[PDB]
Ligand code: HEM
Ligand code: HEM
Ligand code: HEM
């Protein structure tokens with residue numbers, strides 16, 4: 001649903017990221033492949049080493065997307081509908097994976113912004129990432 | 142999301158219920174308590190025998206609610222917002238349970254309307270009941 | 283795994299009246315229609331665009347016959363259920379990489395199908411029984427992981 | 429349960445620098461804030477209306493100290509993990525009636541808390557290790573049921 005405070009908190013914290021967004025993005029990706037190995041099946045062609053530019057590069061691609069969605073918050077099913085077709089109809093990604101990427105995305109934001117990561121914020125980013133996932137799996141429900 | 146066909150199929154089949162809605166409701170309830178015993182914790186004061194009027198009676202209460210939601214389909218967060226507060230904020234029901242009541246609600250509709258229960262319909266009522274649950278757990282996300 | 287005398291027999295009771303060349307295919311079919319993301323696993327089967335395409339696929343219903351074979355099987359070995367599927371476990375686990383939640387899904391649609399044909403013979407006490415079987419069958423396949 | 433030499437030690441490495449009178453209460457607290465339906469189980473603790481009310485509850489943080497005790501404990505008995513929690517299993521299972529999914533939840537928020545204090549010392553290789561511990565710890569408690 002995202003009450004007002006929610007979308008308010010989200011902005012501030014995601015604002016506190018800025019240029020780091022790209023870096024945090026790749027960190028998140030890396031944390032996932034490592035903790036939940038099963039997820040690597042979707043990126044066969046990839047080089048998954050530590051420095052890997054594909055990951056470093058795809059890390060920014062995802063970061064920017066979240067940024068854009070933070071922007072057009074009051075309207076995500078439109079701003080993301082391009083990715084829905086890709087993730088849902090073309091790639092057919094198991095819904096459960098979206099849960100794993102959200103967890104790691106939070107683990108990262110709480111290791112670089114311990115000043116921002118409060119129970120109140122923590123709770124908002126979860127609701128937010130929650131929505132964004134629904135949107136991407138849209139053509140499953 | 143509920144594409145057009147979806148909400149269309151839903152009407153027809155739920156239309157095919159009519160006076161049975163109340164009966165089917167109680168059947169669903171009974172099937173749940175029996176298959177997933179853990180669910181009985183929310184209805185302590187209740188008499189859960191086979192004939193039980195509380196069940197027979199509460200069975201209609203739930204049936205009517207689904208009917209109403211079938212009606213105001215194009216707007217559920219408003220038509221159900223009263224139940225949300227009750228199930229979410231007052232009772233604090235574990236989200237998983239909603240999944241168990243939906244399954245049993247389908248098991249019943251396919252034992253009384255084998256003529257209606259087609260893959261296409263089956264698929265629509267699931268998306269439907271899916272939404273209705275989200276709506277009821279609204280203040281958790 | 284818990285089936286009490288009547289349940290034990292009751293479950294087997296219906297199972298005999300089960301048209302083996304129908305149920306298997308119908309269950310595997312509905313799963314692909316109701317939960318679209320599971321199609322990713324069966325590209326090779328061909329056209330699965332329209333619900334009719336699915337239901338009218340020889341490979342689909344031909345494979346579905348194999349899935350019920352696995353139930354009939356484990357249904358006769360409730361004692362060592364967690365070992366009858368040992369191979370299918372290793373298979374679906376590190377060979378196909380299927381998230382276990384999905385086992386739960388196929389388990390429930392099977393229930394929907396049984397209740398579909400046996401109309402009113404499929405009583406609450408029966409459903410309750412079969413739900414346990416289905417649960418063990420799924421719990422077994424995921425055992426490889428954990 | 430799988431921890432390889434470095435992991436084995438790495439996990440224990442951090443665990444020593446863990447302020448025992450903080451983390452326990454902070455993890456039990458965030459859980460109640462982020463996943464509201466879990467409050468149903470702790471009526472007796474009092475006011476849990478505002479996130480501050482939660483974080484400022486003596487009983488909350490006093491009980492949280494007991495939860496980390498259970499981790500420190502099972503963290504020292506990785507061999508027989510599925511038996512150290514035998515009682516807590518029976519307890520949370522048929523005494524309190526907690527759905528297991530909920531064990532997974534508390535496991536993850538603990539991770540968030542550790543990563544919160546150890547800032548940059550909490551590396552991916554570390555997180556990956558701790559994730560396995562947490563998993564076993566949860567898998568153990570649900571064992572009573574299945
Ligand atoms: C936070 C949720 C997610 C967002 C915001 C997201 C965003 C993106 C973006 C921006 C791209 C598009 C790049 C392009 O235009 O080519 C992409 C591609 C892709 N995503 Fe995601 N994604 C999400 C979750 C996931 C998950 C959970 C998986 C599965 C583990 C996944 C697997 C992929 C794959 C395989 C591609 C194609 C990569 C290629 O071959 O170029 N994504 N994602
Ligand atoms: C299909 C989704 C559901 C719908 C449509 C629904 C609908 C209803 C309705 C109409 C009432 C309100 C009666 C009143 O006004 O007093 C009610 C009450 C209640 N529901 Fe549900 N419900 C749903 C799911 C659940 C689930 C999954 C549980 C938990 C197992 C549950 C537990 C209860 C309880 C305990 C009450 C209060 C009964 C009393 O003491 O009077 N409901 N529900
Ligand atoms: C309790 C549930 C399940 C049972 C009993 C079951 C049983 C089987 C059996 C017997 C085979 C054939 C193995 C052989 O002939 O050697 C098989 C193969 C397979 N299963 Fe299922 N399965 C289950 C769930 C699933 C689920 C949920 C998925 C994932 C969507 C899945 C995906 C597959 C795939 C992709 C194969 C390979 C098919 C092929 O190319 O021949 N199965 N399954």
Ligand code: HEM
Nearest residue numbers: 466469470494495498499516520524526530531534565566
């Ligand atoms: C791995 C996770 C968990 C561990 C290690 C754990 C550990 C404990 C321990 C050690 C106790 C105290 C037992 C005693 O003093 O004899 C306890 C009690 C309890 N736990 Fe947790 N717990 C876990 C997860 C949960 C979850 C997710 C819930 C449900 C939301 C929960 C609900 C309770 C309740 C209600 C009690 C009773 C508290 C009281 O009245 O004293 N626990 N837990």
